[PDB]
C-alpha cells in the first residue's frame, strides 16, 4: 500500500511545491523508486538525453500486450508533473522536468549534491546492542500506549497530541480515557513499514508553518542513510523535526551526533513464525508469542487465562468479543487477525480437508479456511447481537390536511436521503434529525 499511498500524497502536493521538492537529489531518487516499473524505464532513458522526445516514440517503445501499463505509467508521470508536455507544429513533445532531471543525474554520477546525503564521521556503533534495542523500546512503548494496556513509561507530549488529533485511537474526555477505534486496530494489523508511514504521514499533515518542503526532504533523506555511521548535525526546522523523529525512535542522538536507526532503513522500502496461535473448536486460544506486545494486543478481544514463557493460552468468550465490538472493532478484523496468524498445524489440517473435499467432488471449488467454521460463525453472530435493535434520532411528521402535501414531503425527504420510515395509510413519515432542518425549510416554502 506504501507504493500507492505515498504516491497519492505526493500527487496532492501543489505543482510549485513539487518543483521545489525535486531540488534535492536524494528526494528525487526516492520519488524515482515509487513510480511504476514502466515509468522507471522511460524516465531513465530521458535522464541522459537533453532533447525533446515525441510521445508517439514512447508508445512505440511498448509492445501491444503492455498497452494498459503504458497508460498507467504516463498518467502517473503527468500527475506528479514529472513529464512536461509541449504542443508545437502539430507535434506533442514530452520532456523531463529540468530540476528533477539535473538532480537525478547528480545522484547517479559523481557531482555536487550540496551534502544532501550528509557527511560521514567514521564512528560506528553496534546495532544489535543499542540502536536495535533503542528502536524496539521506542516503538514498543508507543504501540503499548496505542493498545491501551497499562505501561509506566508514557509517550512524549508531541506524539500524544498527534494521536489525539489523529483519527485512530480516539480519546474521549467525558470517559476520561483513550480507546482504540476501528482505524487503531487497522494500524496494529498493518506491518511495521505501513505503520511507520501511517504515523509519518499524519505528522506531515499536522505540521503547519517548520516548512513542509524541509520536513519532506529530511524524511526522504533519512531513508538514504544506512544503519549506524553517525552524520554531523541542516536547516533549523530540520533540527527541531529531527528531535521529533528521535522521540519516535527513527533517529538516535547520543545527546551532537545522531545515529540513523534501523527503522529509518525500513522506511526506505519493503525489506514456527512468532505470533502464531492455534484456535480450537472449543474456543480456546494458544499463542506462541513471547513478545509483550503480542500478549497485549491479543488481550484486547481475548480473555487471557494463564501464560508460560513459551506461549500464552486463553479463550474467546462473549465478554471478550463484546468488549472489542463496543470499542469500535469490527468482526471482520477479528477473524482477519486470527487467520493471518494461524499456526502451521491449522494450515496443514485445513489443506488436508480441502484435498479430501476436492477428491470427493472436484467439480465444486471452495476457498481454503484455516480457522474452524464454528468459531468464525459465533464471532459474526455476536456482532449481529449488538445491532439487534437499531435506534434513529429524528422527528415524526403527521396530521397533514391534504394527501398531496404529505406525498410531496415524503418524496422530497427520500430524494435528499433523510427519510427513515413512511406510511401512506396513516399519512405519517419519520425523518432523520440531520434532515429535519431541510424538510422544515422545504415545508415553509
Amino acid at each position: 500500500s506504501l507504493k500507492h499511498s505515498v504516491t497519492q500524497y505526493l500527487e496532492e502536493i501543489p505543482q510549485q511545491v513539487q518543483n521545489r521538492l525535486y531540488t534535492s537529489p536524494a528526494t528525487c531518487l526516492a520519488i524515482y523508486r515509487i513510480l511504476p516499473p514502466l515509468a522507471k524505464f522511460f524516465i531513465m532513458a530521458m535522464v541522459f538525453n537533453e532533447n525533446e522526445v515525441p510521445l508517439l516514440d514512447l508508445d512505440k517503445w511498448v509492445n501491444s500486450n503492455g498497452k494498459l501499463q503504458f497508460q498507467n505509467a504516463i498518467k502517473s508521470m503527468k500527475s506528479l508533473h514529472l513529464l512536461i508536455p509541449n504542443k508545437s507544429s502539430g507535434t506533442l513533445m514530452i520532456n523531463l522536468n529540468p530540476t528533477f532531471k539535473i538532480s537525478l543525474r547528480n545522484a547517479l554520477t559523481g557531482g555536487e549534491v550540496q551534502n544532501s546525503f550528509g557527511v560521514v564521521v567514521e564512528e560506528n556503533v553496534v546495532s544489535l546492542d543499542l540502536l536495535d534495542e533503542y528502536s524496539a523500546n521506542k516503538w514498543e512503548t508507543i504501540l503499548h500506549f496505542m493498545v491501551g494496556t497499562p505501561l509506566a513509561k508514557i509517550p512524549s507530549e508531541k506524539v500524544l497530541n498527534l494521536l489525539k488529533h489523529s483519527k485512530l485511537m480516539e480519546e474521549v474526555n467525558s470517559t476520561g480515557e483513550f480507546k482504540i477505534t476501528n482505524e487503531g486496530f487497522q494500524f496494529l494489523l498493518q506491518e511495521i513499514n505501513s505503520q511507520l508511514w501511517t504515523l509519518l504521514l499524519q505528522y506531515l499533515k499536522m505540521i503547519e508553518t517548520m516548512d513542509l518542503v524541509d520536513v519532506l526532504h529530511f524524511i526522504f533523506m533519512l531513508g538514504a542513510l544506512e544503519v549506524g555511521k553517525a552524520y554531523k548535525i541542516l536547516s533549523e526546522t530540520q533540527r527541531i523535526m529531527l528531535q521529533d523523529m528521535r522521540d519516535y525512535g527513527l533517529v538516535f542522538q547520543k545527546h551532537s551526533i545522531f545515529y540513523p536507526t534501523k527503522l529509518a532503513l525500513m522506511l526506505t522500502s519493503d525489506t514456527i513464525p512468532d505470533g502464531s496461535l492455534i484456535v480450537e473448536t472449543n474456543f480456546k486460544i494458544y499463542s506462541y508469542s513471547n513478545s509483550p506486545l503480542q500478549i497485549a494486543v491479543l488481550s484486547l478481544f481475548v480473555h487471557l487465562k494463564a501464560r508460560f514463557v513459551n506461549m500464552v493460552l486463553g479463550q474467546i468468550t462473549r465478554e471478550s468479543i463484546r468488549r472489542a465490538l463496543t470499542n469500535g472493532i469490527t468482526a471482520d478484523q477479528i477473524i482477519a487477525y486470527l487467520e493471518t496468524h494461524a499456526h502451521p498445524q491449522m494450515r496443514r489440517l485445513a489443506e488436508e480437508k480441502l484435498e479430501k473435499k476436492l477428491e470427493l467432488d472436484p467439480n465444486c471449488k471452495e476457498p481454503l479456511q484455516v480457522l474452524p467454521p464454528t468459531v468464525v460463525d459465533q464471532i459474526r453472530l455476536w456482532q449481529l447481537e449488538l445491532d439487534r435493535v437499531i435506534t434513529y434520532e429524528g422527528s415524526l411528521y403527521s396530521d397533514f390536511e391534504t394527501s398531496q402535501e404529505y406525498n410531496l414531503l415524503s418524496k422530497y425527504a427520500q430524494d435528499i436521503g433523510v427519510l427513515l420510515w413512511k406510511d401512506d395509510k396513516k399519512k405519517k413519515f419519520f425523518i432523520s434529525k440531520e434532515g429535519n432542518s431541510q424538510v422544515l425549510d422545504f415545508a415553509k416554502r
Binding site: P373, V376, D377, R380, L381, L384
Partner: peptide, 9 residues
C-alpha cells in the same frame, strides 16, 4: 455458513 440469509419461516 448461513448468517446473513433471511431467517426461515
Amino acid at each position: 455458513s448461513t448468517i446473513g440469509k433471511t431467517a426461515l419461516g
